[model samples]
Target chain A: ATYAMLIENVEYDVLLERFKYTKQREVLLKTLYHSDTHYTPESLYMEIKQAEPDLNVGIATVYRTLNLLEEAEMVTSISFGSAGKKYELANKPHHDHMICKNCGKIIEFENPIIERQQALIAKEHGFKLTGHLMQLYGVCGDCNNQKAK
Target chain B: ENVEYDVLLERFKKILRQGGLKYTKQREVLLKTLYHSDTHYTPESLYMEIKQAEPDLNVGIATVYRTLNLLEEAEMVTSISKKYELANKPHHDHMICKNCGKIIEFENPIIERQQALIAKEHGFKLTGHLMQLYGVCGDCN
Candidate 1:
């Protein structure tokens, strides 16, 4: 979506518009949409600057923009173990995250039997039951073999 | 708009009696406050609300805290997992609007399945889980 169009949707639209750099806005959108999965602002700054030597976006601005985006609900910020915080599009439906301890890969997926019992557990616990987060951290298949080798 | 305050009170009283818990005015007032609220509130917020009602009554901070724990035990409240506010009762996971802090109730069976799979793979019996979906509200863009 265009920055202007996206800005119009924010509660803090006026504040968002005050950020006048169009290139920075483009970098922000490009990094998020181009990446296969969630990424961090720190990584985005490094990667984008390398591609364009004159690119002036810094991690600080990335973070500031992210927090603003997060507040706008345009991005979902998730913490995956010690990899610091990761950001992804908030539009994706709910799914748990799997962080590769060895390779630092973030994988998102789901399984069923566990899902049904969760609601049951809430009922059993007497919790009026609203929602839950069930992330699984582990070594991915490739990482597991790398360790074996 | 249609909160069943009487039924809620009746349920609370039954729980208190069955659990052999004492009925403190503070506890009653605390639950009543939560019952009436649509948004989750923090302990400080609850205390602030209660304090406003009886300023002279020195309700211990621990008591407000302890009552929250007790209510969670009975499944009367759930914690919103986004780590937004601490004083709020334990409630279901949150679907939060990152910009406006507007929250919407949501559930997805597919995500639940993934949690169980992850836990089992890790040799965890999978006792509990927390879920939150952060997004831009339609109005927010």
Candidate 2:
């Protein structure tokens, strides 16, 4: 079977079986996998409430679900102090982030050389690399323009 | 390492003036404590260190946090997940252990070059970056 078919069907089946307490888990998974946007736990809870107005999912529950997804390697989180943690689906091509300090915009970019550089550094240090996170902070074009004016 | 005590104090005063902040004795003790330390410290740990350095020190918890924030804003320090280090140190990244929370720091000139290249491609001026690698340490594995 193709990689997409295997991952989409198999991963979803496993996750569905793992979370049976409420249909909210299914909703959360579907929302994350289908949407390209990153979400904080609070924002995701609001999204769920909008989708299923009567769904009684709490923010704590959303956090727990996101944590579970992260442990399952289906989701990844970027920690931006004060602004809170942002979660995105792990199925996309691996990329790092450049965050705007002024307006809190997150832009993703991928660099193959950086990826290999990390692996090389890990080997040199005798570390068995598991995962890494990189985030750049600066003024975006719009923010810089506003400051210039 | 040419930052003599008086020179460092003057620089701190200048930064505070630029930011319109006060240069209190408590902040002086905080800066002195941070400058003398070689390890990354959380606010709580730094507070403890300050108390140890001067047993009669009466700085409050809020002052510790406030001073840290002020110093960071003035570019006198850097923070990762609330853990702070003096800004004069060379830029590096962290390798954190998931099991034990052990943090190891490393620097790679190649990676820095790649990051600069990437930022230029995207029209970012590249003020700063945080790179944290998380995994099981040798002991945990």
Candidate 3:
């Protein structure tokens, strides 16, 4: 289901009532809920400030809210080697990512076969796997085409 | 065969010449430590190990950081965030202990095949992948 549809059905007020209302939290939710693009804390802060110039919020606020959202499973984080982290709405089905090394674009995909293999591997290794991060890095088709030209 | 210090030194020299960077003994020592390591290491941990190895060695932390970056760019080293290792080791995934901070390395051919198939299905040419599983190890449990 799309995030828009999910948001409509979710009892956000009930969810938010558990915690005190804060303007930064509101801005964080609104900012992420509206955009499908993945964001780092820095990028999200910049976007928020760009959209609403008068809004006063710090990067620390963005990070705290992101962490809180992640703990609540509202945001999913994807980490790369020494490249910081990226986050997106967690409402989608579980999937892995293919990141374009040339353009830094990200594409997400889910494969039941790969997922099952991971589970089997973990079982064989005697690990009670809690979670996994899988990221594939390569040049995208557009980048490849550009390189050829 | 694993990379030995002599071959690695030669490789470092060639890489440095190609990149127009000067070869230094400090960089050579860092590569030797990483090449000989059986486990992954962060820069700080690697630096500490090097200090322990040669108490008189005066390698700066910044040099370690710069050398690691250079080595990684030259495809001689690989890093998974705070952890790093020589690039020539057989490719494998990581299983990290959330409780004890242990890292167990493992490889599964079945998973590798599945990853290739997934990439083919998505029209992506498989280049490189990182898979890390976080959980409690037996010792931690």
Candidate 4:
């Protein structure tokens, strides 16, 4: 439990352990970390407003930060499917994403084989692999079923 | 990149020595990792690597930052922002496919030269460039 959630929680900021959390992203992160769920920026906006009533995290800010995060590289967002784009933290010790084009859902996956290949590919090109961001697109089961329906 | 581990390790130890510092296993691991790996490391990344490599040593993050500074000061490693990579790899970019997530490595003189030109004109010394172009491959379509 986040024991500090209620009374006596005053002024003590509950912060993330990984990557120095700046103010805005830090607030956004709390909600992300608090759940195992994925979020569209719109859904995340409403969650953050109630989850952190004091912060006044506007949907516009949520939308903008998700956009800014394309460069911040702090969070990962899936491809824009028919629905709004979705986002999640990149703190899974780093992994790429698989997105459903129909429902805009995100599926996170990792492959050590792919990881090793990236390193080798970077070496083949004479550039050492430092970091990378990747996402794969596909139709998820639910979305694929919707088409059948 | 032919500057191999022994020669690089030797230079690193001498810097620590000449600076009136003692040689220790924790410090050695930092250079050995940098010497062998062809990758950039943030101070925290190095700290995490050494922690797992020599968990018994329980090296402090403070030491990682210090050891990184020690190496970079001696030019054994260089950094862009807080990320550290050996001097061998610098000024490179990526070509990533929006479809398959394949990345092709490429570098452009126009972008590199132009990056510096704008920074120079703006009265800022260019420290590094952060750039990559994203697109779908012909095959992916």
Candidate 5:
């Protein structure tokens, strides 16, 4: 179930279904799907560059798409304070999801109140508060506008 | 949907059945305890409650720990405070009191809207958000 034709991956399909779709993210999803390795944005760019250099996926797009994927809940990351992050996918877990009523798009979101609380709670216990998981479902503006016409 | 025990009970039992695990009195009781109360429990405290509710079962903290983790990974429960609670309550973050040591759940609409705003700015649709806040409760002050 390739995106255009070769995704052995919706589970990429869900993102394909929910997200509005972008070139960089589509590329990231396809490349990352078959991988068993966790990738830093920098390292993965080399792989994508060599694999489909003609696609011209820049290092900047890699960063953008990754956080996009991160926020959109397509991929998970091992995050640290200004140090580095490694990205991969975890099957079924935390974070909130936004489901578009019309387009069926589910965008992932995180809150500052949520993050700081999680961290402080962990700090109180002398542990590192890594992340928390939650879900939300809603209709997106893109869908509502398109639906109106 | 609704975060009530009956609803959560149905799902928990289904998970038990689907996961091919033994359906036991203790596990059901564990979830029931979370539902009947809104308290965030330390492993020791939760285990004691389980035993207290039905001392005949002789539930162990080990089982308590294991089951808490199992439910947590299932996202049916949370240890966000380094203590445990059912994820049943919708959209309320925990305001754990250090002074009096109590658990109080809260909701902030202003903060929630900010999350919604963040998503739409990306041209994304909207749905749900959740959070936990660590601070003293009003009673503590």
Candidate 6:
């Protein structure tokens, strides 16, 4: 989507107050634009501070802002095991993550089969199920190929 | 007769004694506060609630933190991740309303079984599970 459209969709004022800090807001926008899906606050903090020295976004601030972002519906945060929370743009299409345990690479995938089956199961339990989060951890192609090396 | 609740009280007292932590009025108020919180809560929230019971208590934020960690280890309460920092729990997952932000607990044996099956298929020794489902609740929809 266009930049104007993106700005209009995710209101800047909403993002600003939710973050309440210039550096965090800046880093959030950068993550939304560049990484879009595959970035952690820890990863981006290092990258952004490298480019702009004054933006000393600490880990605590990153955790706090990520929590706020998740609260404000500005981003979707998913925990990959005991590691840092992985972030993705809120406006992306609905999907689940398949993370490779060895390399820590998350591959997003959409499966209508499993989705339909889950809906059926939820309905069977008398639950009007609405949403779900699933992360399938496994070795990716590269990791599996290089396992013996 | 079945075991009385005093046995549990004795157990808590034993924990406090073992840790060398004083069993004070503030701790009593804190325990009372935790008993009433069926939903997720933060330490600050607990401290504010405890203040309602004891107006002059010296329960600072640090004390709240310390008490929460202690109570957690004592298995008096469990903590779960929320929109912000960690929140109190029965240690279950949540299904949050997208519009109104209401939370509902989901309990599914089938999903649990499927996860076990998946783990077995993948040669993983199953351990723990955490599933958070976020969507519009009945009211919002």
Task: Highest lDDT: give the candidate number.
Answer: 2
Give the lowest summed-lDDT range of ten residues in model 3 chain B: B1-10
Give each model's whole-structure lDDT.
0.54, 0.67, 0.66, 0.57, 0.60, 0.53
- The digit string of per-residue lDDT tens for model 4 on A12-51 reads 1212433343566777766664444568887888888766
- Candidate 6 docks with a DockQ of 0.06
In CAPRI terms, where does candidate 6 land? incorrect
Indicate the worst ten consecutive residues by lDDT in candidate 6 chain A: A1-10
Per-residue lDDT tens digits of candidate 5, residues A1-149? 00110111113334466546567667777677545457888878988988888788888988988887789776788664333688876555355555453444556666677566455554554433223344444446555423111
> Per DockQ, what order, best first?
2, 3, 5, 6, 1, 4
Candidate 4: the clashing residue pairs are none
Question: Residues B30-113, candidate 6, lDDT per residue (tens digit)?
Answer: 654543223345877767766765789967766777766776677655667611122223234445443454455555555556
Model 2 residue runs over 4 Å out of place are A1-94, A145-149, B1-90
Please report, as a residue range, the 10-residue window in candidate 5 chain B with the lowest summed lDDT.
B132-141
Which residue runs of candidate 4 sit more than 4 Å off their true CA positions? A1-149, B1-3, B89-141
RMSD of each: 18.6, 17.3, 17.9, 22.1, 19.1, 18.9
Highest DockQ scorer: 2
lDDT (tens digit, per residue) of candidate 6 on A34-65: 33235676776676667666767677876776
- Candidate 3 global lDDT: 0.66
Q: How well is each residue in B1-141 modelled by candidate 4, as lDDT tens digits?
A: 121244457777898898766778988877766644444689998788778777898899997888778778877777897988656435355655433445565554544454444444433333333333334444553
The window of 10 residues in a row where model 4 chain B has the poorest summed lDDT is B122-131
Candidate 2 structure quality by residue, lDDT tens digits, A1-149: 00110001223344466544567777887776444467888888888899887878888888888888888777778664354798876644357888654455678887888888877766665566766767775556555522111
Q: Candidate 5: global Cα-lDDT?
A: 0.60
Instruction: Arrange candidates by lDDT, descending.
Output: 2, 3, 5, 4, 1, 6
True contacts kept of each: 0.09, 0.43, 0.40, 0.00, 0.19, 0.11
- Model 2 residue B97 lDDT score: 54
lDDT: which is higher, 1 or 5?
5
Better-scoring candidate (lDDT), 2 or 6: 2
